[PDB]
Tab-separated table of C-alpha atoms and ligand atoms in Angstrom:
chain	number	residue	atom	x	y	z
A	1	UNK	CA	0.000	0.000	0.000
A	2	UNK	CA	0.867	3.770	0.085
A	3	UNK	CA	2.952	5.301	2.940
A	4	UNK	CA	4.384	8.840	3.504
A	5	UNK	CA	8.221	8.960	3.828
A	6	UNK	CA	10.746	11.404	5.411
A	7	UNK	CA	13.158	13.416	3.120
A	8	UNK	CA	16.338	11.638	1.883
A	9	UNK	CA	19.463	13.329	0.375
A	10	UNK	CA	20.330	12.532	-3.314
A	11	UNK	CA	21.885	13.830	-6.644
A	12	UNK	CA	20.419	16.533	-8.993
A	13	UNK	CA	17.292	14.842	-10.437
A	14	UNK	CA	15.747	15.784	-13.845
A	15	UNK	CA	12.294	17.484	-13.447
A	16	UNK	CA	9.422	14.934	-12.977
A	17	UNK	CA	7.434	16.538	-16.211
B	1	UNK	CA	24.979	20.810	-2.943
B	2	UNK	CA	22.064	19.367	-0.831
B	3	UNK	CA	19.050	17.885	-2.715
B	4	UNK	CA	16.095	16.056	-1.063
B	5	UNK	CA	13.447	13.781	-2.704
B	6	UNK	CA	10.506	15.509	-4.478
B	7	UNK	CA	7.549	15.963	-2.051
B	8	UNK	CA	3.832	16.880	-2.481
B	9	UNK	CA	3.000	20.638	-2.270
B	10	UNK	CA	-0.577	19.964	-1.086
B	11	UNK	CA	-4.109	19.098	-2.257
B	12	UNK	CA	-4.304	22.187	-4.584
B	13	UNK	CA	-2.410	20.788	-7.669
B	14	UNK	CA	-4.134	17.262	-7.703
B	15	UNK	CA	-7.605	18.936	-7.349
B	16	UNK	CA	-6.933	21.258	-10.368
B	17	UNK	CA	-5.781	18.198	-12.442
B	18	UNK	CA	-9.162	16.496	-11.722
B	19	UNK	CA	-11.055	19.728	-12.641
B	20	UNK	CA	-9.038	20.058	-15.925
B	21	UNK	CA	-9.985	16.386	-16.696
B	22	UNK	CA	-13.720	17.037	-15.954
B	23	UNK	CA	-13.780	20.318	-17.989
B	24	UNK	CA	-11.449	18.921	-20.703
B	25	UNK	CA	-13.408	15.706	-21.501
B	26	UNK	CA	-16.814	17.460	-21.842
B	27	UNK	CA	-15.262	20.685	-23.230
B	28	UNK	CA	-13.070	19.292	-26.056
B	29	UNK	CA	-15.772	16.664	-26.738
B	30	UNK	CA	-18.221	19.559	-27.344
B	31	UNK	CA	-15.641	21.151	-29.762
B	32	UNK	CA	-15.292	17.835	-31.728
B	33	UNK	CA	-19.137	17.570	-31.775
B	34	UNK	CA	-19.716	21.065	-33.362
B	35	UNK	CA	-16.989	20.607	-36.059
B	36	UNK	CA	-17.928	17.011	-37.134
B	37	UNK	CA	-21.752	17.644	-37.100
B	38	UNK	CA	-21.361	20.541	-39.597
B	39	UNK	CA	-19.877	18.648	-42.591
B	40	UNK	CA	-20.193	19.326	-46.422
B	41	UNK	CA	-18.702	22.594	-47.890
B	42	UNK	CA	-19.698	24.545	-44.697
B	43	UNK	CA	-16.335	23.762	-42.947
B	44	UNK	CA	-13.889	26.668	-42.355
B	45	UNK	CA	-10.181	26.515	-43.386
B	46	UNK	CA	-9.281	26.748	-39.642
B	47	UNK	CA	-11.708	23.912	-38.587
B	48	UNK	CA	-9.226	21.101	-39.538
B	49	UNK	CA	-6.647	22.465	-36.998
B	50	UNK	CA	-9.341	23.208	-34.319
B	51	UNK	CA	-10.611	19.554	-34.475
B	52	UNK	CA	-7.022	18.152	-34.196
B	53	UNK	CA	-6.309	20.602	-31.286
B	54	UNK	CA	-9.444	19.182	-29.565
B	55	UNK	CA	-8.157	15.572	-30.210
B	56	UNK	CA	-4.679	16.439	-28.761
B	57	UNK	CA	-6.237	18.044	-25.622
B	58	UNK	CA	-8.885	15.265	-25.083
B	59	UNK	CA	-6.350	12.344	-25.259
B	60	UNK	CA	-4.014	14.082	-22.743
B	61	UNK	CA	-6.878	15.171	-20.381
B	62	UNK	CA	-7.822	11.427	-19.816
B	63	UNK	CA	-4.251	10.766	-18.439
B	64	UNK	CA	-4.474	13.672	-15.874
B	65	UNK	CA	-6.257	11.642	-13.037
B	66	UNK	CA	-3.244	9.226	-13.196
B	67	UNK	CA	-0.860	12.230	-12.829
B	68	UNK	CA	-3.041	13.707	-10.000
B	69	UNK	CA	-2.492	10.429	-8.025
B	70	UNK	CA	1.299	10.590	-8.803
B	71	UNK	CA	1.579	14.181	-7.385
B	72	UNK	CA	-0.318	13.481	-4.089
B	73	UNK	CA	1.637	10.193	-3.518
B	74	UNK	CA	4.808	12.452	-3.304
B	75	UNK	CA	5.892	11.275	-6.834
B	76	UNK	CA	5.170	7.473	-6.678
B	77	UNK	CA	3.623	5.681	-9.746
B	78	UNK	CA	1.347	2.656	-8.935
B	79	UNK	CA	-0.039	2.115	-12.515
B	80	UNK	CA	2.875	0.004	-13.875
B	81	UNK	CA	5.506	0.537	-16.614
B	82	UNK	CA	3.030	0.318	-19.594
B	83	UNK	CA	0.779	3.143	-18.296
B	84	UNK	CA	3.891	5.214	-17.320
B	85	UNK	CA	5.132	4.822	-20.955
B	86	UNK	CA	1.698	5.686	-22.494
B	87	UNK	CA	0.846	8.558	-20.036
B	88	UNK	CA	4.230	10.360	-20.502
B	89	UNK	CA	4.098	9.855	-24.324
B	90	UNK	CA	0.646	11.562	-24.538
B	91	UNK	CA	2.024	14.650	-22.630
B	92	UNK	CA	4.644	15.350	-25.343
B	93	UNK	CA	2.275	14.229	-28.191
B	94	UNK	CA	-0.151	16.938	-26.875
B	95	UNK	CA	2.790	19.401	-26.369
B	96	UNK	CA	3.901	19.067	-30.027
B	97	UNK	CA	0.460	18.590	-31.730
B	98	UNK	CA	-1.117	21.612	-29.910
B	99	UNK	CA	1.876	23.871	-30.784
B	100	UNK	CA	1.768	22.603	-34.418
B	101	UNK	CA	-2.051	23.140	-34.620
B	102	UNK	CA	-1.509	26.770	-33.492
B	103	UNK	CA	1.220	27.320	-36.168
B	104	UNK	CA	-1.177	25.711	-38.679
B	105	UNK	CA	-3.975	28.152	-37.662
B	106	UNK	CA	-1.510	31.113	-37.802
B	107	UNK	CA	-0.108	30.071	-41.240
B	108	UNK	CA	-3.710	29.596	-42.527
B	109	UNK	CA	-4.360	33.294	-41.618
B	110	UNK	CA	-1.029	34.243	-43.315
B	111	UNK	CA	-1.953	32.537	-46.650
B	112	UNK	CA	-5.460	34.143	-46.501
B	113	UNK	CA	-4.758	37.749	-45.308
B	114	UNK	CA	-1.251	38.399	-46.838
B	115	UNK	CA	-1.606	36.183	-50.011
B	116	UNK	CA	2.082	35.981	-51.190
B	117	UNK	CA	1.416	33.624	-54.168
B	118	UNK	CA	-1.654	33.626	-56.537
B	119	UNK	CA	-4.871	31.654	-55.660
B	120	UNK	CA	-3.834	28.875	-58.164
B	121	UNK	CA	-0.790	27.610	-56.136
B	122	UNK	CA	-2.232	28.811	-52.733
B	123	UNK	CA	-4.754	25.883	-52.278
B	124	UNK	CA	-5.734	26.736	-48.645
B	125	UNK	CA	-7.823	23.533	-48.097
B	126	UNK	CA	-5.081	21.281	-49.638
B	127	UNK	CA	-2.210	23.014	-47.682
B	128	UNK	CA	-4.270	22.608	-44.482
B	129	UNK	CA	-4.953	18.900	-45.245
B	130	UNK	CA	-1.215	18.220	-45.927
B	131	UNK	CA	0.076	20.122	-42.808
B	132	UNK	CA	-2.475	18.373	-40.494
B	133	UNK	CA	-1.134	14.943	-41.653
B	134	UNK	CA	2.538	16.081	-41.253
B	135	UNK	CA	1.984	17.538	-37.707
B	136	UNK	CA	0.481	14.214	-36.450
B	137	UNK	CA	3.463	12.293	-37.971
B	138	UNK	CA	5.954	14.854	-36.474
B	139	UNK	CA	4.342	14.878	-32.958
B	140	UNK	CA	4.269	11.024	-32.838
B	141	UNK	CA	7.953	10.755	-33.961
B	142	UNK	CA	9.296	13.616	-31.747
B	143	UNK	CA	7.537	12.072	-28.684
B	144	UNK	CA	8.910	8.533	-29.443
B	145	UNK	CA	12.126	8.944	-27.257
B	146	UNK	CA	9.709	9.488	-24.289
B	147	UNK	CA	7.873	6.186	-25.135
B	148	UNK	CA	11.209	4.220	-25.153
B	149	UNK	CA	13.242	5.898	-22.305
B	150	UNK	CA	10.372	6.072	-19.715
B	151	UNK	CA	10.224	3.179	-17.159
B	152	UNK	CA	9.054	2.550	-13.557
B	153	UNK	CA	12.142	2.354	-11.347
B	154	UNK	CA	13.723	3.268	-8.007
B	155	UNK	CA	15.518	6.572	-8.866
B	156	UNK	CA	18.456	6.914	-6.371
B	157	UNK	CA	18.269	5.215	-2.891
B	158	UNK	CA	14.702	6.566	-2.247
B	159	UNK	CA	12.118	3.766	-1.610
B	160	UNK	CA	9.580	4.913	-4.289
B	161	UNK	CA	8.637	3.460	-7.720
B	162	UNK	CA	8.549	6.628	-9.885
B	163	UNK	CA	7.808	7.228	-13.617
B	164	UNK	CA	11.044	8.808	-14.985
B	165	UNK	CA	13.276	9.126	-18.106
B	166	UNK	CA	15.874	6.301	-17.934
B	167	UNK	CA	19.036	7.233	-19.891
B	168	UNK	CA	20.923	4.031	-18.780
B	169	UNK	CA	19.894	2.479	-22.169
B	170	UNK	CA	21.099	5.269	-24.578
B	171	UNK	CA	23.678	7.283	-22.498
B	172	UNK	CA	27.115	5.974	-21.417
B	173	UNK	CA	28.474	6.196	-17.797
B	174	UNK	CA	29.185	9.990	-17.681
B	175	UNK	CA	27.043	11.312	-20.619
B	176	UNK	CA	23.828	10.924	-18.469
B	177	UNK	CA	23.357	14.753	-18.255
B	178	UNK	CA	24.225	15.105	-22.008
B	179	UNK	CA	21.098	13.137	-23.067
B	180	UNK	CA	18.835	15.058	-20.620
B	181	UNK	CA	20.225	18.437	-21.839
B	182	UNK	CA	20.155	17.141	-25.466
B	183	UNK	CA	16.551	15.854	-25.575
B	184	UNK	CA	15.417	18.580	-23.123
B	185	UNK	CA	16.651	21.605	-25.154
B	186	UNK	CA	15.356	20.118	-28.479
B	187	UNK	CA	11.937	19.463	-26.783
B	188	UNK	CA	11.656	23.195	-25.834
B	189	UNK	CA	13.032	24.247	-29.289
B	190	UNK	CA	10.740	22.100	-31.548
B	191	UNK	CA	7.819	22.321	-29.041
B	192	UNK	CA	7.810	26.029	-28.026
B	193	UNK	CA	10.715	28.222	-29.372
B	194	UNK	CA	10.425	27.363	-33.150
B	195	UNK	CA	6.521	27.172	-33.109
B	196	UNK	CA	6.050	30.508	-31.201
B	197	UNK	CA	8.558	32.292	-33.543
B	198	UNK	CA	6.554	31.085	-36.619
B	199	UNK	CA	3.275	32.339	-34.969
B	200	UNK	CA	4.886	35.788	-34.277
B	201	UNK	CA	6.404	36.153	-37.807
B	202	UNK	CA	3.016	35.149	-39.356
B	203	UNK	CA	1.337	37.853	-37.184
B	204	UNK	CA	3.963	40.490	-38.222
B	205	UNK	CA	3.201	39.927	-41.960
B	206	UNK	CA	-0.602	39.837	-41.275
B	207	UNK	CA	-0.321	43.191	-39.370
B	208	UNK	CA	1.811	44.622	-42.265
B	209	UNK	CA	-1.070	44.098	-44.799
B	210	UNK	CA	-3.892	45.137	-42.359
B	211	UNK	CA	-1.998	48.451	-41.626
B	212	UNK	CA	-2.934	49.696	-45.161
B	213	UNK	CA	-6.579	50.490	-44.242
B	214	UNK	CA	-9.087	50.862	-47.130
B	215	UNK	CA	-11.411	53.911	-47.230
B	216	UNK	CA	-14.962	53.823	-48.674
B	217	UNK	CA	-16.820	56.876	-50.090
B	218	UNK	CA	-20.104	57.495	-48.198
B	219	UNK	CA	-21.560	59.468	-51.177
B	220	UNK	CA	-21.122	57.080	-54.191
B	221	UNK	CA	-19.484	53.921	-52.776
B	222	UNK	CA	-15.944	54.090	-54.280
B	223	UNK	CA	-13.443	52.019	-52.261
B	224	UNK	CA	-9.892	53.426	-52.191
B	225	UNK	CA	-7.444	50.486	-52.009
B	226	UNK	CA	-3.864	51.444	-50.890
B	227	UNK	CA	-2.504	48.525	-53.034
B	228	UNK	CA	-4.014	50.025	-56.265
B	229	UNK	CA	-4.097	53.749	-55.368
B	230	UNK	CA	-5.242	56.349	-57.949
B	231	UNK	CA	-2.466	56.793	-60.632
B	232	UNK	CA	-4.768	58.880	-62.918
B	233	UNK	CA	-5.218	61.541	-60.154
B	234	UNK	CA	-1.451	61.578	-59.385
B	235	UNK	CA	-1.544	59.085	-56.460
B	236	UNK	CA	1.173	56.357	-56.710
B	237	UNK	CA	0.194	52.742	-55.726
B	238	UNK	CA	1.179	51.851	-52.149
B	239	UNK	CA	0.504	55.301	-50.609
B	240	UNK	CA	-1.655	55.321	-47.431
B	241	UNK	CA	-4.960	57.306	-47.325
B	242	UNK	CA	-3.529	59.792	-44.740
B	243	UNK	CA	-0.507	60.475	-47.058
B	244	UNK	CA	-2.821	61.546	-49.970
B	245	UNK	CA	-2.663	65.365	-50.652
B	246	UNK	CA	-5.717	67.378	-49.445
B	247	UNK	CA	-6.575	68.628	-53.010
B	248	UNK	CA	-7.487	65.036	-54.094
B	249	UNK	CA	-11.211	64.168	-54.423
B	250	UNK	CA	-13.276	60.988	-55.122
B	251	UNK	CA	-12.597	59.922	-58.776
B	252	UNK	CA	-16.298	58.957	-59.255
B	253	UNK	CA	-18.346	61.725	-57.484
B	254	UNK	CA	-15.776	64.446	-56.590
B	255	UNK	CA	-16.052	64.620	-52.765
B	256	UNK	CA	-13.282	65.634	-50.315
B	257	UNK	CA	-11.213	63.383	-47.988
B	258	UNK	CA	-13.521	64.267	-45.007
B	259	UNK	CA	-16.438	62.297	-46.608
B	260	UNK	CA	-14.404	59.019	-46.618
B	261	UNK	CA	-15.012	56.276	-44.013
B	262	UNK	CA	-12.261	53.927	-42.695
B	263	UNK	CA	-13.276	50.277	-43.138
B	264	UNK	CA	-12.683	47.888	-40.186
B	265	UNK	CA	-12.812	44.320	-41.638
B	266	UNK	CA	-14.852	41.783	-39.577
B	267	UNK	CA	-11.813	39.462	-39.063
B	268	UNK	CA	-13.390	36.935	-36.644
B	269	UNK	CA	-10.912	34.057	-37.364
B	270	UNK	CA	-7.846	36.258	-36.573
B	271	UNK	CA	-9.377	37.302	-33.177
B	272	UNK	CA	-10.013	33.602	-32.239
B	273	UNK	CA	-6.437	32.514	-33.205
B	274	UNK	CA	-4.733	35.584	-31.527
B	275	UNK	CA	-6.418	34.819	-28.119
B	276	UNK	CA	-5.492	31.066	-28.543
B	277	UNK	CA	-1.775	32.024	-29.041
B	278	UNK	CA	-1.764	34.665	-26.190
B	279	UNK	CA	-3.237	32.127	-23.672
B	280	UNK	CA	-0.853	29.349	-24.921
B	281	UNK	CA	2.157	31.716	-24.486
B	282	UNK	CA	1.048	32.671	-20.914
B	283	UNK	CA	0.411	28.981	-19.972
B	284	UNK	CA	3.538	27.373	-21.563
B	285	UNK	CA	6.209	30.155	-21.023
B	286	UNK	CA	6.819	29.518	-17.216
B	287	UNK	CA	7.147	25.694	-17.699
B	288	UNK	CA	9.734	26.054	-20.524
B	289	UNK	CA	11.615	28.976	-18.828
B	290	UNK	CA	11.970	27.196	-15.403
B	291	UNK	CA	13.158	23.960	-17.148
B	292	UNK	CA	15.724	25.896	-19.316
B	293	UNK	CA	16.965	27.847	-16.214
B	294	UNK	CA	17.315	24.426	-14.464
B	295	UNK	CA	19.500	23.179	-17.398
B	296	UNK	CA	21.503	26.469	-17.683
B	297	UNK	CA	21.936	26.368	-13.862
B	298	UNK	CA	23.981	23.166	-13.394
B	299	UNK	CA	26.045	23.980	-16.548
B	300	UNK	CA	26.788	27.682	-15.745
B	301	UNK	CA	27.234	26.888	-11.958
B	302	UNK	CA	24.306	29.095	-10.733
B	303	UNK	CA	23.816	29.671	-6.917
B	304	UNK	CA	22.316	26.720	-4.927
B	305	UNK	CA	19.486	28.914	-3.475
B	306	UNK	CA	18.230	29.671	-7.045
B	307	UNK	CA	17.846	25.914	-7.865
B	308	UNK	CA	15.652	25.531	-4.708
B	309	UNK	CA	13.402	28.412	-5.968
B	310	UNK	CA	12.934	26.719	-9.413
B	311	UNK	CA	12.092	23.322	-7.778
B	312	UNK	CA	9.252	24.748	-5.594
B	313	UNK	CA	7.773	26.906	-8.424
B	314	UNK	CA	7.891	24.024	-11.030
B	315	UNK	CA	4.773	21.991	-9.829
B	316	UNK	CA	2.674	25.189	-10.290
B	317	UNK	CA	4.389	25.924	-13.675
B	318	UNK	CA	3.363	22.456	-15.017
B	319	UNK	CA	-0.134	22.811	-13.454
B	320	UNK	CA	-1.157	26.035	-15.325
B	321	UNK	CA	0.523	24.593	-18.505
B	322	UNK	CA	-1.830	21.557	-18.227
B	323	UNK	CA	-4.884	23.879	-17.620
B	324	UNK	CA	-4.360	25.100	-21.270
B	325	UNK	CA	-6.026	21.822	-22.456
B	326	UNK	CA	-9.473	22.709	-20.974
B	327	UNK	CA	-8.906	26.484	-21.573
B	328	UNK	CA	-9.638	26.536	-25.377
B	329	UNK	CA	-13.410	25.481	-25.264
B	330	UNK	CA	-14.050	28.461	-22.912
B	331	UNK	CA	-12.125	30.755	-25.346
B	332	UNK	CA	-14.360	29.589	-28.259
B	333	UNK	CA	-17.437	30.221	-26.031
B	334	UNK	CA	-16.424	33.912	-25.512
B	335	UNK	CA	-14.759	34.748	-28.899
B	336	UNK	CA	-15.912	32.231	-31.597
B	337	UNK	CA	-19.501	33.100	-32.748
B	338	UNK	CA	-19.826	29.939	-34.941
B	339	UNK	CA	-19.031	27.652	-31.930
B	340	UNK	CA	-21.570	29.652	-29.802
B	341	UNK	CA	-24.339	29.299	-32.468
B	342	UNK	CA	-23.657	25.544	-33.032
B	343	UNK	CA	-23.788	24.767	-29.249
B	344	UNK	CA	-27.134	26.640	-28.874
B	345	UNK	CA	-28.475	24.771	-31.984
B	346	UNK	CA	-28.163	21.334	-30.247
B	347	UNK	CA	-29.547	22.942	-27.011
B	348	UNK	CA	-33.078	23.756	-28.333
B	349	UNK	CA	-33.438	20.777	-30.764
B	350	UNK	CA	-31.389	18.016	-29.051
B	351	UNK	CA	-32.918	18.219	-25.536
B	352	UNK	CA	-36.536	18.599	-26.852
B	353	UNK	CA	-36.895	15.574	-29.271
C	1	OLC	C1	14.147	11.915	-33.190
C	1	OLC	C2	14.562	13.223	-32.521
C	1	OLC	C3	13.602	13.690	-31.439
C	1	OLC	C4	13.996	15.004	-30.772
C	1	OLC	C5	13.053	15.473	-29.668
C	1	OLC	C6	13.148	14.683	-28.371
C	1	OLC	C7	12.128	15.114	-27.327
C	1	OLC	C8	12.126	14.255	-26.095
C	1	OLC	O1	12.049	13.054	-26.096
C	1	OLC	O2	12.216	15.000	-24.986
C	1	OLC	C9	12.268	14.323	-23.707
C	1	OLC	C10	11.837	15.349	-22.686
C	1	OLC	O3	12.740	16.458	-22.702
C	1	OLC	C11	11.755	14.777	-21.289
C	1	OLC	O4	11.284	15.752	-20.369
C	2	ZN	ZN1	-17.446	59.199	-54.253
């Protein structure tokens, strides 16, 4: 099922649209 | 610097996406109804591009409830890889087809108002029928890299199955950014920059011919055309009515310049297309600007605080850009009189039966 998650550090992601 | 996983802004953006779906299905469906019901030789030269623009908007509008779920689930796709491939493909198909329909409408006004070549080669209906076939072939081919590269995967070490562009297939080990900047810039160029520049140049030439206003005589009915002039009375062809010397009179009844009326042509089609371009420019400009500034930010080494500003403003930039799909039927309801009359025709006869 769906579950809300805390923020996690990562690399520069390309825009999701 | 520091970059966290993309989170949901709130319930505002997914609610608008549902409203755009609800207004877009019934709205563009009502546009396709009015155009297809009125067949025969009654169809306008612009109608072929209006119907295709309604098709492009309708097909994309159906995929919005899937994207509304994706936004609220803090960017997590639960519809599988096939629907991720099809949903993302129809965004860019709509992006290209709608921009190409607008250039088609603008170029149709250019060939009609300006008239650079004679009516023999012109063939407005044929040129419109050829360009409508080419734009659907172009939009489908230009959106194909989205159909192939999109997959459902776990982008970075974040526990979420998201619908993203996977360059691991085409790009090497380092050239990952090269394919995003390559396909990203060309998407904005062939989908917004090149189309909007054609629309503006078409409008500049249309305005250039309209500027030479014709003047009709209220006494006899003689129409002074700036293109023809009056060479017999010492007026060279091309000279504007205001430039004509005050001693000149009507060549048919002999009345002064004061008895001449400026004619304001009932250009309905131009008014409909101008408002369609203006709204498109206001809806698409922030989305393309923010995305270009995001590209020209990592390359030109822009400040880290500026990248954070672009990231938070982007979900709203895409939102209003997607509203453009359900925006056109409302624009035809307030500016197009033929759409207004056709909708009211099926109101009194259709409901009654
Ligand atoms: C064939 C050449 C096609 C050139 C256009 C590619 C457009 C494209 O796939 O763009 C991906 C998009 O930038 C992702 O957000
Ligand atoms: Zn006269």
